[PDB]
Amino acid sequence: LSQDFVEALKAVVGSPHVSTASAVREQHGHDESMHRCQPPDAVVWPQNVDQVSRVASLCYNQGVPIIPFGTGTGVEGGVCAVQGGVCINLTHMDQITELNTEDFSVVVEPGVTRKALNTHLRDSGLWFPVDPGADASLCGMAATGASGTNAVRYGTMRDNVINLEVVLPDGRLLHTAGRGRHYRKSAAGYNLTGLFVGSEGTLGIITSTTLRLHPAPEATVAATCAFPSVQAAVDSTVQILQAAVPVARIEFLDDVMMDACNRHSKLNCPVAPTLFLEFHGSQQTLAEQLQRTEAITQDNGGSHFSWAEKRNELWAARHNAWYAALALSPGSKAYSTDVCVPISRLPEILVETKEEIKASKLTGAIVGHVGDGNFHCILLVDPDDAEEQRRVKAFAENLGRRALALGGTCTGEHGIGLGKRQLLQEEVGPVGVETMRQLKNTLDPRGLMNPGKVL
Ligand SMILES: Cc1cc2nc3c(=O)[nH]c(=O)nc-3n(C[C@H](O)[C@H](O)[C@H](O)COP(=O)(O)OP(=O)(O)OC[C@H]3O[C@@H](n4cnc5c(N)ncnc54)[C@H](O)[C@@H]3O)c2cc1C
Numbered sequence: 001l002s003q004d005f006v007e008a009l010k011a012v013v014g015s016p017h018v019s020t021a022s023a024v025r026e027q028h029g030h031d032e033s034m035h036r037c038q039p040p041d042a043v044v045w046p047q048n049v050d051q052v053s054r055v056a057s058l059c060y061n062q063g064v065p066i067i068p069f070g071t072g073t074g075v076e077g078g079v080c081a082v083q084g085g086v087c088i089n090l091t092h093m094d095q096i097t098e099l100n101t102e103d104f105s106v107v108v109e110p111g112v113t114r115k116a117l118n119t120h121l122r123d124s125g126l127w128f129p130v131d132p133g134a135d136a137s138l139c140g141m142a143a144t145g146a147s148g149t150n151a152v153r154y155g156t157m158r159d160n161v162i163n164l165e166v167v168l169p170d171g172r173l174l175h176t177a178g179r180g181r182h183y184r185k186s187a188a189g190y191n192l193t194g195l196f197v198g199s200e201g202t203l204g205i206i207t208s209t210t211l212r213l214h215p216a217p218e219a220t221v222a223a224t225c226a227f228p229s230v231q232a233a234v235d236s237t238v239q240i241l242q243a244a245v246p247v248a249r250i251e252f253l254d255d256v257m258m259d260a261c262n263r264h265s266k267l268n269c270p271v272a273p274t275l276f277l278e279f280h281g282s283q284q285t286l287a288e289q290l291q292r293t294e295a296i297t298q299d300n301g302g303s304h305f306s307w308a309e310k311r312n313e314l315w316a317a318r319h320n321a322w323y324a325a326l327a328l329s330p331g332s333k334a335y336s337t338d339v340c341v342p343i344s345r346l347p348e349i350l351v352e353t354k355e356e357i358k359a360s361k362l363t364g365a366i367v368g369h370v371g372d373g374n375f376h377c378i379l380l381v382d383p384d385d386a387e388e389q390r391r392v393k394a395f396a397e398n399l400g401r402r403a404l405a406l407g408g409t410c411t412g413e414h415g416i417g418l419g420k421r422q423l424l425q426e427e428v429g430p431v432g433v434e435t436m437r438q439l440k441n442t443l444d445p446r447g448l449m450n451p452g453k454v455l
Pocket residue numbers: 031032067068069070071072073074075077078079090110131132133134136137139140141142143144145146147148149200201202204205206207319320321322323413414450453
C-alpha cells in the first residue's frame with residue numbers, strides 16, 4: 001500500500017483515524033471465528049458519511065479492497081482480509097437519531113449496539129428485540145442478516161429493518177427505501193432494503209439502519225425445562241410451534257451445552273437436554289400459554305418448569321454459550337454450524353447431529369433457536385491441530401448437506417463469509433449463483449467490496 005495512498009486516506013479522515021501499524025491491523029484481521037488470514041493493509045475510522053463515501057471512492061478507483069468492520073463479532077470470517085486492502089472501522093459513527101416512538105422506529109449509526117439502543121430506550125416503553133449473544137453493531141447485524149433468541153416471536157433483522165443508508169462501492173449514497181422514509185409496508189418499485197440485509201459487506205457499506213421498535217411486554221415469565229432426551233425436547237418444541245403457542249423464546253441446549261453453561265455462568269440447572277423458555281403477555285394470556293405449553297412438555301417427559309434478576313442471569317448465560325463452549329477446552333477456537341430446516345424435520349437432524357457428535361472424537365455443544373427450526377453445533381478446534389480442524393470442517397459440511405437434503409438452508413442467521421461458500425452454491429444452484437453474482441457485479445463491478453466472501 002503506497003505512501004501517496006495512505007496520505008490520501010489521512011486527508012479524508014484525519015491522521016489519527018488511519019493506521020498502518022501491524023498490531024492495529026492484526027486486531028482488525030479476524031473476528032470471533034476460527035478463520036485466520038493476513039491482516040488488512042490499513043485500518044481507517046471515518047467520522048461521518050461524507051468521509052465513508054470519500055474513503056470508498058478512493059479505494060475503489062485505486063483498485064484497493066474495502067472490508068467493512070463493525071464490532072468484529074462475526075463467526076464466518078467476514079472481516080478477514082483475504083486480499084488485503086483497507087479495513088473501514090465504522091464505529092465512531094455512533095449516534096442514535098430520528099427516534100420516532102409514536103411510529104415505532106429509530107435510526108442508528110454503526111457504532112450503536114443493541115445494548116446502547118435499549119439503554120437509550122428505557123422509560124420509553126419500547127425495545128429492540130433481535131438479540132445476538134454478542135454486543136454487536138446493529139448495522140453489522142443488518143449486514144449479516146442476524147437473528148437471536150427473540151426472533152421466534154419478534155422477527156429477524158430482515159423482519160425489523162425498514163430502511164438502510166448504504167455507501168455503494170464507488171462512493172454513491174443510497175437510501176434503500178428513500179431518504180428519511182419509514183412505514184409498515186410498501187409495494188413501491190423493487191424492494192432494495194431486503195437485498196442489502198444479509199449482504200455481509202459485499203454490496204456496500206451500511207452507514208445507518210432504520211429499525212422497527214416493539215412495545216415492551218406487559219409481563220414476562222421465564223423458565224427452564226429438563227428432558228430425558230434430545231428427541232423429547234425437540235418433539236416438545238415442534239409440538240409447541242404446531243399448537244401455535246406464541247412463545248417469546250424457546251432455546252435448546254443439549255446436556256453438553258447445559259453443563260458448559262453451568263460451569264461458565266454458575267447456573268445450576270440439571271445436566272440434561274433443556275429448553276429455556278420465555279413467555280410474554282398479560283397475566284391472563286401468560287397463564288393460558290403456560291398451561292398449554294406445560295401440557296406439551298409433560299407429554300414428552302419434561303420436568304415441571306423451573307421458574308427480574310434471575311432471568312437476566314438465565315439469558316446472559318445463554319447469550320454467552322459460545323464462550324461457555326470455548327471454556328471446555330482453553331486455548332481452542334470454535335466453528336459453529338447454523339442450519340435451518342422445515343420444523344417437522346428438526347427432530348431427525350438434531351438427534352442425528354447428537355449421535356454423530358457422540359460417534360466422533362470432536363468436542364461439540366448443541367444450542368440454539370429451535371423455534372425457528374434452527375440450531376448451532378459449536379465445534380471446538382485446536383488452532384495447531386491440522387487433523388482436527390480438517391475433521392471439524394468435514395463435520396460441518398456433512399451437517400450442512402444433510403440440512404440441504406431436508407429442504408433447509410445452510411445458515412439461518414450467521415451468514416456465509418468464508419466458511420459456507422460451497423454449501424451456498426449447492427443450496428441455490430447454478431441459476432441462483434449466477435443471479436446473485438450479477439447483482440454483486442452491478443453494485444461492485446471491480447469486485448473490491450469485501451472480496452472472497454459469500455460468492
Ligand atoms: C458470543 C456470540 C454470540 C452470537 N450470537 C449470535 C446470534 O444469536 N445470532 C446471530 O445472528 N449472530 C450471532 N453472533 C454473530 C455476530 O454477533 C453477528 O453475526 C453480528 O451481526 C455481527 O456484527 P458485527 O458488527 O460484530 O460484525 P463484523 O464481524 O464486524 O462483520 C460481519 C460481516 O458484516 C460486514 N459488515 C459489518 N458491519 C457492516 C456495515 N456497517 N456495512 C456493511 N457490512 C458490514 C463485515 O464486512 C463482515 O463481512 C454471535 C457472536 C458471538 C461472538
